[PDB]
Amino acid sequence: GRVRTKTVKKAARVIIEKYYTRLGNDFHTNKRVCEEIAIIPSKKLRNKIAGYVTHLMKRIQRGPVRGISIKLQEEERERRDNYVPEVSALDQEIIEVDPDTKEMLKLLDFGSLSNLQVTQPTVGMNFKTPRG
Amino acid sequence: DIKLFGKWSTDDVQINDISLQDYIAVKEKYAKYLPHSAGRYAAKRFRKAQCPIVERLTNSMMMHGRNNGKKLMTVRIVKHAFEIIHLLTGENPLQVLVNAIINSGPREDSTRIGRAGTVRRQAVDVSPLRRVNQAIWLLCTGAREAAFRNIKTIAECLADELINAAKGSSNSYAIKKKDELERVAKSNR
Amino acid sequence: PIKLARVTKVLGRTGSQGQCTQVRVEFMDDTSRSIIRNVKGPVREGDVLTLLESEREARRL
Amino acid sequence: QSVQVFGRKKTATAVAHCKRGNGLIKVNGRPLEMIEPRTLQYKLLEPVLLLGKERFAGVDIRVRVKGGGHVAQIYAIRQSISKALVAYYQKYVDEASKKEIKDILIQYDRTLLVADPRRCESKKFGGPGARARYQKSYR
Amino acid sequence: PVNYYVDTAVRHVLLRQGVLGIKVKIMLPWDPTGKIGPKKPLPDHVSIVEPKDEILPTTPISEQK
Amino acid sequence: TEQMTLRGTLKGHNGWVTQIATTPQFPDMILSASRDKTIIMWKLTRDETNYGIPQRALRGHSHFVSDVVISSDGQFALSGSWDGTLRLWDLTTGTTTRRFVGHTKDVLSVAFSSDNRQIVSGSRDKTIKLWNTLGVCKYTVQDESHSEWVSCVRFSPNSSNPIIVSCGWDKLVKVWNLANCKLKTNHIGHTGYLNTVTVSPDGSLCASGGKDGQAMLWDLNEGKHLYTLDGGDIINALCFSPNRYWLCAATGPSIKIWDLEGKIIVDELKQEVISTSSKAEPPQCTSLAWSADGQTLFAGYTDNLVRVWQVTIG
RNA sequence: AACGAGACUCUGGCAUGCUAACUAGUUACGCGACCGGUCGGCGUAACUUCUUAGAGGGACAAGUGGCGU
């Protein structure tokens, strides 16, 4: 079995969340950026961090991960969040309303609404699941 | 072309069974000069199937405690055993060896299933690889039992074992023990 | 008579000590029929078995 | 001129020196035909039989062998010769025949150009050898 | 890492009824380039340098020193 | 109407083709440095089977070969590799002559002089160096060098104004002078680290590329930013056309060509016939090199093949 | 969060790249013996492939194809 450990996984997550700009997809370059910055003991421990970094950067292209937080990714997700269509989903020419809701609006002095259209309710009073 | 020991060609040999055709390595990329390659076929699973069948024969003959590393003696045992068969049958010793391997393997076997005590064995199939391995085992076991305390030199008792098996004859240790083995497995159907 | 069937997939390991393997095999003639069989030895997909009795279907060992 | 290339089984180390010549192959100043174990004679003959006598026609290879055993030393010679002829090309002919010979050699046998890395495991106390243990007594 | 990060001592004290054994183990701090403690860090401790904050430019400017 | 079609590929490496070099004195010879510690000379046959085949293999280094260059006389070749070394070859016998030591980390770039008598190399040391052709260093450039790796440094083809152009991961463009080490202009305005810088043949403009994908062209004379061009992906290499005043850049797996007079694209170079590999990224384009004439374009790839493109005259 | 596991130390496998060698050799050239060949016969200069041992590299499930909420 070839399973990493919390030491290498934690160190790699920290490196990725702190130095996203310089890290990339290439292993042999991420191996050389880790030695420049992090004070790591010998090559065997250096490589297992810089390999999981390369593995874990591919997942970022697929989308965000529940372990790291890049403010550049925050900006990208905010650009995604600041999305509104030109025509909203709540402005409709016609709104379908039940006969029972129409009476509630009548009690709400909203009987002059012109976008409404009273529809025929379902007749069979069968809305329960069979028992057994 | 590259022929065994410089005098036994390979391109004329044909494997009959489609079942063991890919588990016997004799013809195109396995055509070697000697049954000696310092191979590493025992590192991963199913790698031994790529071992030449003549070299597979060579190993199983250096068995019992006094011979476990004396491979050069077994290379000449096989070398002399191939030049004797060709004098009797007149055919290719490689073809004789292949036909002996095909004939002497069991095709059905029995496996212990009942709890300890009374034996309730079932009937199961046999892998092609195990069939090849067990054919080699039986052929090498019959060669050294028939020569243990005889004036007959070994590589003459091996030749006689291989001749009688390519004919499917009952004068052969491997055929005798293959027939007794599928007999019991049919009883357990 | 003797039938030849081709291993299509390996299901698992059965036997008192795990010495046998479940396979499903597809016949060469009338290839539409596939049955469950037990084998002994190393088996991988693509191996072709020689069935002497070709009516039985396998069960747990 | 010349190249010097080694081959290496377990502890044996053969060194082959190749220069401009007329077809002399000699190990320890002795003909290749009569290296002491004649049973493994074809292993020494495999490179020249695979390539052909016409490639070892402008090259003169002399081999010096030391260490190990008989069988390891024979295996250290067939690799040394093969590596030295590959090294003689791609330096004195072109990068076109080196590829041809390297391919022809490596399809037949990878140990003709790559060394087997296996070496003896150390003995461990409590057993005759690396893995075998002493017989354990009960009652 | 135990051969240089710890210091061990075993001593005997003879009382009226017998002998008592006293064992003392001390695990030292790091102290880089220091008299006390090993200069080598623990083999599992990874120190990641905090980057110097910088402002990425918005418009191009040439500095013609 | 001026497009480019795949004329063929050269194979023979086992690692990323890192750099390609061409010479005007030998039209039938190019050099390829790759990430397998070997430099290959190519003999171009231009036959039906394959475009060219390797002729010499320079086996001197013990790590990735990062850059190679050819002297004006087509007999010498200067290399810089990742073990830390700058090696001088002899393309007649293919054996090294001088070894150039002194950098403490991996030497990233190489540049050999126009008058063939001075060398500049940049490394991970954050220190640029000047060298003589005998194997000695004249200046070490420690006083206000790049605070990060020197990604690439190279000379200019003008004897009027001795200039060397340096590149770095500190997101800055440096301009220097010969006979000294004085800084002239610290060009600011690059986001992300930089990878390649190239000097125009006239010696008045230079182009640099980096991770942002934006390739800015800076006036080597009058020292002001003049162009900024948008390549969608990261730029790994840049190059200038010898005579047709074009700009070429390897943006990821594509190659964009800019007229620099129309300020617009001219052709996109990418082979996308393969569609089976629907889960792996396409191989990237590492380096570029134009022929002496100006009608051939060799591109190295992470695929580890070299691809040749021809300028359709018709 | 901590100890234990892992990491760590020693060892084996690779480097025609680096630093070195009369208490290690190789190649070449002479002198010599014998029938261009052999010489662990003898002496000089080319250097480090072989021997020795220091530094630094090199392997990380890293690349591809499958399986896996």
JSON list of C-alpha atoms in Angstrom, two decimals, chain A residues 4-85:
[
{"chain": "A", "resi": 4, "resn": "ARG", "atom": "CA", "xyz": [0.25, 9.32, 2.47]},
{"chain": "A", "resi": 5, "resn": "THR", "atom": "CA", "xyz": [0.18, 10.53, 6.08]},
{"chain": "A", "resi": 6, "resn": "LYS", "atom": "CA", "xyz": [-1.23, 13.55, 7.90]},
{"chain": "A", "resi": 7, "resn": "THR", "atom": "CA", "xyz": [2.21, 15.20, 8.06]},
{"chain": "A", "resi": 8, "resn": "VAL", "atom": "CA", "xyz": [2.73, 15.21, 4.29]},
{"chain": "A", "resi": 9, "resn": "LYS", "atom": "CA", "xyz": [-0.94, 15.91, 3.53]},
{"chain": "A", "resi": 10, "resn": "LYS", "atom": "CA", "xyz": [-1.07, 18.85, 5.95]},
{"chain": "A", "resi": 11, "resn": "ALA", "atom": "CA", "xyz": [2.21, 20.31, 4.68]},
{"chain": "A", "resi": 12, "resn": "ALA", "atom": "CA", "xyz": [1.09, 19.98, 1.06]},
{"chain": "A", "resi": 13, "resn": "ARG", "atom": "CA", "xyz": [-2.29, 21.58, 1.77]},
{"chain": "A", "resi": 14, "resn": "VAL", "atom": "CA", "xyz": [-0.54, 24.49, 3.49]},
{"chain": "A", "resi": 15, "resn": "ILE", "atom": "CA", "xyz": [1.91, 24.92, 0.61]},
{"chain": "A", "resi": 16, "resn": "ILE", "atom": "CA", "xyz": [-0.94, 24.94, -1.91]},
{"chain": "A", "resi": 17, "resn": "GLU", "atom": "CA", "xyz": [-3.09, 27.39, 0.07]},
{"chain": "A", "resi": 18, "resn": "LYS", "atom": "CA", "xyz": [-0.13, 29.73, 0.55]},
{"chain": "A", "resi": 19, "resn": "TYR", "atom": "CA", "xyz": [1.72, 29.59, -2.81]},
{"chain": "A", "resi": 20, "resn": "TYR", "atom": "CA", "xyz": [-0.94, 28.87, -5.41]},
{"chain": "A", "resi": 21, "resn": "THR", "atom": "CA", "xyz": [0.59, 31.28, -7.92]},
{"chain": "A", "resi": 22, "resn": "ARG", "atom": "CA", "xyz": [3.93, 29.50, -8.39]},
{"chain": "A", "resi": 23, "resn": "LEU", "atom": "CA", "xyz": [2.76, 25.89, -8.13]},
{"chain": "A", "resi": 24, "resn": "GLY", "atom": "CA", "xyz": [1.57, 24.06, -11.23]},
{"chain": "A", "resi": 25, "resn": "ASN", "atom": "CA", "xyz": [1.02, 20.69, -12.90]},
{"chain": "A", "resi": 26, "resn": "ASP", "atom": "CA", "xyz": [4.68, 19.69, -13.37]},
{"chain": "A", "resi": 27, "resn": "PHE", "atom": "CA", "xyz": [6.17, 17.52, -10.63]},
{"chain": "A", "resi": 28, "resn": "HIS", "atom": "CA", "xyz": [9.81, 18.41, -11.24]},
{"chain": "A", "resi": 29, "resn": "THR", "atom": "CA", "xyz": [9.10, 22.14, -10.91]},
{"chain": "A", "resi": 30, "resn": "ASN", "atom": "CA", "xyz": [6.95, 21.80, -7.79]},
{"chain": "A", "resi": 31, "resn": "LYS", "atom": "CA", "xyz": [9.77, 19.67, -6.37]},
{"chain": "A", "resi": 32, "resn": "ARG", "atom": "CA", "xyz": [12.09, 22.66, -6.84]},
{"chain": "A", "resi": 33, "resn": "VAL", "atom": "CA", "xyz": [9.69, 25.30, -5.50]},
{"chain": "A", "resi": 34, "resn": "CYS", "atom": "CA", "xyz": [9.17, 23.34, -2.27]},
{"chain": "A", "resi": 35, "resn": "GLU", "atom": "CA", "xyz": [12.88, 23.23, -1.45]},
{"chain": "A", "resi": 36, "resn": "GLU", "atom": "CA", "xyz": [13.23, 26.98, -2.05]},
{"chain": "A", "resi": 37, "resn": "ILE", "atom": "CA", "xyz": [10.54, 27.86, 0.48]},
{"chain": "A", "resi": 38, "resn": "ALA", "atom": "CA", "xyz": [9.70, 25.17, 3.01]},
{"chain": "A", "resi": 39, "resn": "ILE", "atom": "CA", "xyz": [12.41, 24.08, 5.44]},
{"chain": "A", "resi": 40, "resn": "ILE", "atom": "CA", "xyz": [12.01, 20.35, 4.83]},
{"chain": "A", "resi": 41, "resn": "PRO", "atom": "CA", "xyz": [14.31, 17.49, 5.83]},
{"chain": "A", "resi": 42, "resn": "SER", "atom": "CA", "xyz": [15.57, 14.91, 3.38]},
{"chain": "A", "resi": 43, "resn": "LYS", "atom": "CA", "xyz": [14.64, 14.23, -0.25]},
{"chain": "A", "resi": 44, "resn": "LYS", "atom": "CA", "xyz": [12.29, 11.34, 0.52]},
{"chain": "A", "resi": 45, "resn": "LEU", "atom": "CA", "xyz": [10.04, 13.56, 2.64]},
{"chain": "A", "resi": 46, "resn": "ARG", "atom": "CA", "xyz": [10.47, 16.48, 0.23]},
{"chain": "A", "resi": 47, "resn": "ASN", "atom": "CA", "xyz": [9.24, 14.44, -2.73]},
{"chain": "A", "resi": 48, "resn": "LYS", "atom": "CA", "xyz": [6.18, 12.91, -1.07]},
{"chain": "A", "resi": 49, "resn": "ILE", "atom": "CA", "xyz": [4.92, 16.42, -0.33]},
{"chain": "A", "resi": 50, "resn": "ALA", "atom": "CA", "xyz": [5.74, 17.72, -3.82]},
{"chain": "A", "resi": 51, "resn": "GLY", "atom": "CA", "xyz": [4.06, 14.71, -5.42]},
{"chain": "A", "resi": 52, "resn": "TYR", "atom": "CA", "xyz": [0.81, 15.07, -3.54]},
{"chain": "A", "resi": 53, "resn": "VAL", "atom": "CA", "xyz": [0.94, 18.78, -4.42]},
{"chain": "A", "resi": 54, "resn": "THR", "atom": "CA", "xyz": [1.06, 17.90, -8.12]},
{"chain": "A", "resi": 55, "resn": "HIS", "atom": "CA", "xyz": [-1.71, 15.33, -7.67]},
{"chain": "A", "resi": 56, "resn": "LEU", "atom": "CA", "xyz": [-3.83, 17.82, -5.73]},
{"chain": "A", "resi": 57, "resn": "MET", "atom": "CA", "xyz": [-3.45, 20.68, -8.23]},
{"chain": "A", "resi": 58, "resn": "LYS", "atom": "CA", "xyz": [-5.19, 18.68, -10.97]},
{"chain": "A", "resi": 59, "resn": "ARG", "atom": "CA", "xyz": [-8.27, 18.40, -8.74]},
{"chain": "A", "resi": 60, "resn": "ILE", "atom": "CA", "xyz": [-8.41, 22.20, -8.51]},
{"chain": "A", "resi": 61, "resn": "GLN", "atom": "CA", "xyz": [-8.91, 22.52, -12.26]},
{"chain": "A", "resi": 62, "resn": "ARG", "atom": "CA", "xyz": [-11.88, 20.16, -11.96]},
{"chain": "A", "resi": 63, "resn": "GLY", "atom": "CA", "xyz": [-13.22, 22.58, -9.34]},
{"chain": "A", "resi": 64, "resn": "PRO", "atom": "CA", "xyz": [-12.79, 23.55, -5.69]},
{"chain": "A", "resi": 65, "resn": "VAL", "atom": "CA", "xyz": [-11.79, 21.16, -2.92]},
{"chain": "A", "resi": 66, "resn": "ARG", "atom": "CA", "xyz": [-13.01, 21.09, 0.68]},
{"chain": "A", "resi": 67, "resn": "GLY", "atom": "CA", "xyz": [-9.50, 21.38, 2.12]},
{"chain": "A", "resi": 68, "resn": "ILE", "atom": "CA", "xyz": [-7.88, 24.55, 0.74]},
{"chain": "A", "resi": 69, "resn": "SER", "atom": "CA", "xyz": [-8.92, 28.17, 0.20]},
{"chain": "A", "resi": 70, "resn": "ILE", "atom": "CA", "xyz": [-7.28, 30.42, -2.41]},
{"chain": "A", "resi": 71, "resn": "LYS", "atom": "CA", "xyz": [-8.43, 34.03, -2.53]},
{"chain": "A", "resi": 72, "resn": "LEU", "atom": "CA", "xyz": [-8.03, 33.95, -6.32]},
{"chain": "A", "resi": 73, "resn": "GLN", "atom": "CA", "xyz": [-10.48, 31.04, -6.32]},
{"chain": "A", "resi": 74, "resn": "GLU", "atom": "CA", "xyz": [-12.64, 33.16, -4.02]},
{"chain": "A", "resi": 75, "resn": "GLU", "atom": "CA", "xyz": [-12.61, 35.91, -6.65]},
{"chain": "A", "resi": 76, "resn": "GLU", "atom": "CA", "xyz": [-13.48, 33.44, -9.41]},
{"chain": "A", "resi": 77, "resn": "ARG", "atom": "CA", "xyz": [-16.37, 32.01, -7.40]},
{"chain": "A", "resi": 78, "resn": "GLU", "atom": "CA", "xyz": [-17.57, 35.55, -6.64]},
{"chain": "A", "resi": 79, "resn": "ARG", "atom": "CA", "xyz": [-17.57, 36.31, -10.36]},
{"chain": "A", "resi": 80, "resn": "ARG", "atom": "CA", "xyz": [-19.64, 33.14, -10.78]},
{"chain": "A", "resi": 81, "resn": "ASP", "atom": "CA", "xyz": [-21.94, 34.24, -7.93]},
{"chain": "A", "resi": 82, "resn": "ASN", "atom": "CA", "xyz": [-22.47, 37.75, -9.33]},
{"chain": "A", "resi": 83, "resn": "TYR", "atom": "CA", "xyz": [-24.60, 36.29, -12.12]},
{"chain": "A", "resi": 84, "resn": "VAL", "atom": "CA", "xyz": [-28.13, 37.51, -12.88]},
{"chain": "A", "resi": 85, "resn": "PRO", "atom": "CA", "xyz": [-30.01, 37.03, -16.17]}
]
